[PDB]
Amino acid sequence: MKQSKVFIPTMRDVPSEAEAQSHRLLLKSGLIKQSTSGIYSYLPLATRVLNNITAIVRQEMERIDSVEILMPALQQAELWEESGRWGAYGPELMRLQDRHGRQFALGPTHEELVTSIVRNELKSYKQLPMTLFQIQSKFRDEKRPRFGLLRGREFIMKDAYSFHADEASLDQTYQDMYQAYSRIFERVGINARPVVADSGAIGGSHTHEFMALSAIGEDTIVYSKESDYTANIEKAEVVYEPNHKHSTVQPLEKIETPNVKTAQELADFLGRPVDEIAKTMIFKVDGEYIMVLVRGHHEINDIKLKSYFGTDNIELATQDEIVNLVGSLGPVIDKEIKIYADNFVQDLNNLVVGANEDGYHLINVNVGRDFNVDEYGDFRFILEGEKLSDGSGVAHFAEGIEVGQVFKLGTKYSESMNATFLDNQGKAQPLIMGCYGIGISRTLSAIVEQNHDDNGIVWPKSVTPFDLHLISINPKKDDQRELADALYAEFNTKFDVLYDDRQERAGVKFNDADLIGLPLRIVVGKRASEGIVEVKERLTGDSEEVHIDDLMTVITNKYDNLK
Amino acid sequence: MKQSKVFIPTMRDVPSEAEAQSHRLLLKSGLIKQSTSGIYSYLPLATRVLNNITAIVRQEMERIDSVEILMPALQQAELWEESGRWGAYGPELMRLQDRHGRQFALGPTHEELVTSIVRNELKSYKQLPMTLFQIQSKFRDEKRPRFGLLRGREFIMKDAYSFHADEASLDQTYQDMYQAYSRIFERVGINARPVVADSGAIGGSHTHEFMALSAIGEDTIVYSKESDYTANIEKAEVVYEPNHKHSTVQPLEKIETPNVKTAQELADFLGRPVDEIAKTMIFKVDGEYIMVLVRGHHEINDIKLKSYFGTDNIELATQDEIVNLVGSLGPVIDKEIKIYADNFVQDLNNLVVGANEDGYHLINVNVGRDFNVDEYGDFRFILEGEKLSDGSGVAHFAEGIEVGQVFKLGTKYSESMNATFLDNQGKAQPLIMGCYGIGISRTLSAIVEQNHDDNGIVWPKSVTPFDLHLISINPKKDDQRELADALYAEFNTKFDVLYDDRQERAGVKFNDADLIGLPLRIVVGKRASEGIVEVKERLTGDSEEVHIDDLMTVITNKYDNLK
C-alpha cells in the first residue's frame, strides 16, 4: 500500500488522561480513535494487526478441532431468563427493546446462545465431543472503562464452547485449549503465564487465566521458584502455622486518638508497630451484617470471603448502614453480630482496635473476655516472602494482564436450558460444557505493552501490519521517486510493503515510521542514482547501506532472523 | 476437518414458513439457525463460506486502495443528532441507554461514525482522496424480516466511504467501486447487473444498485435489448406521447354498483375494458391531503411521487383520515383538494370513477366540467412492452435481489458535522463523500439462490466451505477406513477436505453430502482393497471409478476445470 492512500492520523501530543503506554502509543501512532468512553474505532494499521492475530487464532483453533461459528449480538431476554442471568446481572448487561416492546440483551458472552444452538441437535453420545468458537464483538457496560483497549465497553473476544459426554472428554479439550492458548500468545509476541484462577463463590471447577506479564497489569501472580505453582493473588491460600507474640493480659482501656484515621497513623500515634493493630471492616453477606478482623499490615481479600461464605452477594456496608448498626470501627459492641477474624490475629493478644466512637480507640482488648470470634480463617492476601500453600517455597509477585481464561463449566446451562443427549446406556444426560476465551482487542494492547520503546511500537514479525517500510526522502527528485517506485513493485509481491510515497519532510516520515513500528525500513535517498539504499532495523536501530542488487537477499535474511 | 467434529445439523423436514429456496436450503443443510425473527447464527459451514466471501472482498478492496477499518456498533445519540438522523428516523433505528442514562444507537450504517473519524484529520487537499471500508454487523429493526438472510435485523454489511477534494475525484472512486463490485459478485458466483437507482426524494446524485438476477427478487429491473439502459422499475421514466381515445361528451351519471370493490370488478360490471376506469387514491404529502388519478390497468408509483413533490413524507391516508376528508373514492367532491393525474389519463374522456359513496360509482365524468386536474405527470410504473425513456426500444422486466449499492453522497454529512479540508487556494471546503455497500449475508443467500438444485446447494469453487467431500461407506471395514484415512492425509494439504468419517449409514452420508454441496466427492467403498474409489461431481452428478495412483491428477484436473 502507498502510505498517501492509508489513513494514519499520527499525533504530535498525547493527552494527559491516557495512562497506559499501549493506549498512549495506539493513539499517537494513529491506530485507534475513541468514539466515546470505552468505545473505539480500529484504524487501518490496527485492523491489519487484528487480521494477523485472528489468522493465528484460526490456525490454532483448527489444529485442536475447535470449529468456527458466528453468533448474534442481539439476544432475546427470554433466553437469558432460562439461565437466570437476566435477573442475576445488573447494569453491566446492556439491554434494549425492539419496536414491538420485546426485550433483548447485547451479548457480553454467549453461554445461552450457544446452548440454544446445540440443544436437541447434539442428541447422542456418538456426536460428542463438539467444540465451537467465534471471534465477535461483546458488549459490557463496564463501571470504569480504562486503559484504551484493555477495558472497553465494546470489545473483540474469541469465545469457545465445548460439549462432552463425560468429565474425561472435558478434561481432554480443556488441555487442548490450554495448550492452544499458550501457542497463540507466544506466536503473537506475548510473554504469558497460565495461572490458577478463582472458580467463583459457589463452584469449585478447574480454571486457569492466561496472564500477559507486564507492569501495567492489574492482576498479581503469586509464583514459586521451586515448583510450577502459579496462582492469582485472589486465590493464593495462606497456610497459618502458629507463632504467638503474646504478652501479659492487661485491662481494656479507651484512649483519645485525635486526627487518627488509618491503622498506620494509629501505630505511629501509640508508638507500636502496625502489625499489632487489628483493623475492623463491616460487610453485608446475603443481607446479614458481619465483622471481619485483620492485622494492620494485612488487607482483606473479598474473593476469599465470597468463596468462604459461598455467595457472590458480599459488599462493604455503606456510611448510612454503618451508623444505623453502630469513626474507626471495632469488635467490642453490645449487639448480635458475627465476628470473623483472619488466622494471623491469633498470634496477638491485647489488641488495638476502634472504639466505635470518633476520636477514640481501644487498647488491651482480648478475645474471650472483651469479645468473641465466631470463626477464624484465611481472609487476606498473601504477602511477598511468605511460604506457599504447596510447601515448595517463598511467594514472589509478578504483575499481569488477563488476556484469556479456560473454564470447566459443567452442566449449569444444560440443566437450566434442558440440553440433553442420550448416553451409552440410552438415558438422557445434560451436556457437559467447557468455555474458553481470549480478549482479542485486549491482546492487541498487551502486544504493544510488551513490544515498544520510547520512539514507538516495535511490532513482532507475526503481527506487524506491514513487513517493510519503504521511504523516499525527497520524491521531488526523479531518481529517488523512480527507484522507490521500482523497489515497491519488486518487494510488494513477497512482502507487504508500506511505501511512504508522501510529499512530506524526511523528519516527519521517520518520526511516523518510528511510531508505526514495522520491523525493517528501506530508505531511498541521496545515493539512489548509485543504486544504493539504507536498511534500518526498528528493534536495534542498526543501519547499513545496501546496493539494490543485494537488497532482496539482505532483507529476506534479516526478515527470516527476526524473532 | 473430520465431519464427526463439525456441527452440521441437517434436517429431514423444512418448516412451511420458509419460502425462499436459499432460506429453505440453508436451514435444511445445517448452515444457519434462527435465534429469533431476523436474527441468525452462522453455523460452521456458513462461517467458512462467509470467510471465503470476505477474503475475495478484501482482495478487491485492496486493488482499488479501499483501506479496511473497523468501527463500533454502539454509537452515541449526540453523533446522530449532529446529522439530524436521530430525529429523522423512527423505530427501524435501534436505540438504547447505558447505565448513566446516556442514549445510543446501534449502527444501521456508519456515515456519522466515519465522518467523526476523518474530521480534522483529513485536513488538507494533499491528503485526498481517501477510501475506508469495514465488514461489520449492522442493526435495523426491519418492519418485516423475511426470507432468512435476505432481510435480517442483525446482518453483515461491507460498507465503504470515500473522501474527496472535488467532484472529478469522487467520480473516479465511484467508477473504481462500481468495477470492484462487478468483480466481487462475478467471483463469488453471482450473476448481477448494475442498474440506475432512485437518488431519493430531495437529491439528484448518481447511484447504481447491483441486482442479483433471481426469481425470488423483490426488485424489478427494466432493461433494453438495443442499448445499455438498465433501471429499477421505481426509477424508470414513462414518456407520454398523446394517443387520444376520446368519444362524444356525455352527461355525468351516478350508477348503482353493488358488491363492486376493485377497478377490474367495475370493468366487468359495466362491460368496459379496465383501462377506461380511472382509480383514485388519497395521499398525505407534508401534512396536506391530495388525490392521485391513474388508469385501471396502471398502478401508482410512490417513489416517483416522492421525487416529484421532493419529500419523503408521503403516505396513503388512513381509513379514519379518508372518512374525515370525504366506498370507492373519486375526484368529484366539493372541497379544496389538489388533484394530480397520471399523463395517460389524458388519452380518455368520459371517465369512470368512484362516487365517494358506498355502493355507487360515477360514469361520463369529464375534466374541466366536473373536476379540475391541478398537474399532470409520470406517477406510475412502466409496463412491459412500452417504449423506454432513452428511445432505444421496448421495456423488458427481470427480477432482482439488491446485493449492493454505490452512491455519490456529496457534502451532506461534512456540512452538518463540520468536516472540512483546506483546498488548493488555502480556503476551507467540506469533504466530498461517496458511500458504497455490499450486503455480505444477503449475498451469501443470493449465491445459494443462483447455485442449487432439488437435492441441495451446489457451491461455486470460489466460496465452497470445503473443496472435496471424502466419504467412507462403511468405516467398520478396515480397508475402507484405512484407505480413507490415508487419502485424507494426502489431499488435506493442497485442498480443504471435509472427511465424512462418521459411523452413519451410506444413505444419510450421501443425502448430507447432496445438501452440503461441495464440488467434488471421493467415495471409498467396496473396492478399497483394490485401491479403487469413485469420484462424483456435484453439479453434473457424473460418477467414475478412479485408482488411487491416478486420483491426485484426476481431482486436480476436475477442480481446475470447475467454473
Ligand SMILES: Nc1ncnc2c1ncn2[C@@H]1O[C@H](COP(=O)(O)OP(=O)(O)NP(=O)(O)O)[C@@H](O)[C@H]1O
Ligand atoms: N471490558 C473488556 N475490554 C476488553 N477485553 C475484555 C473485557 N472484558 C473481558 N475482556 C477479555 O475477554 C476475555 C474473556 O472474558 P471474561 O473471562 O468474561 O473476562 P473477565 O473475567 O470479565 N476479565 P476482567 O473484567 O478484566 O477481570 C478476558 O480474559 C479478557 O482478555
Ligand SMILES: Nc1ncnc2c1ncn2[C@@H]1O[C@H](COP(=O)(O)OP(=O)(O)NP(=O)(O)O)[C@@H](O)[C@H]1O
Ligand atoms: N435487513 C437486511 N438484511 C440483510 N441485508 C441487508 C439488509 N438491509 C440492507 N442489506 C444489504 O446491505 C446493502 C447496503 O445497505 P442499504 O443500501 O442501506 O440497503 P437498503 O437500501 O435498505 N436495501 P432494502 O432494504 O433491501 O431495500 C444492501 O444492498 C443489501 O445488500
Ligand SMILES: O=C(C[C@H]1NCCC[C@@H]1O)Cn1cnc2cc(Br)c(Cl)cc2c1=O
Ligand atoms: O464470560 C465469562 C465466562 C466465559 N465465557 C465465555 C468466554 C470466556 C469467559 O471466561 C465470565 N463473565 C464475565 N463477565 C460477564 C459480564 C456480564 Br454483564 C454477564 Cl451477563 C456475564 C459475564 C460472565 O459470564
Ligand SMILES: O=C(C[C@H]1NCCC[C@@H]1O)Cn1cnc2cc(Br)c(Cl)cc2c1=O
Ligand atoms: O445506508 C444507506 C446508504 C449507504 N450507507 C453506507 C453503506 C451503503 C448504503 O447504501 C441507506 N440507508 C438505509 N437504511 C437505513 C436505515 C436506518 Br434505521 C438509518 Cl438511521 C439509515 C439508513 C440508511 O441510510
Ligand SMILES: [Mg+2]
Ligand atoms: Mg469483567
Ligand SMILES: [Mg+2]
Ligand atoms: Mg432497507
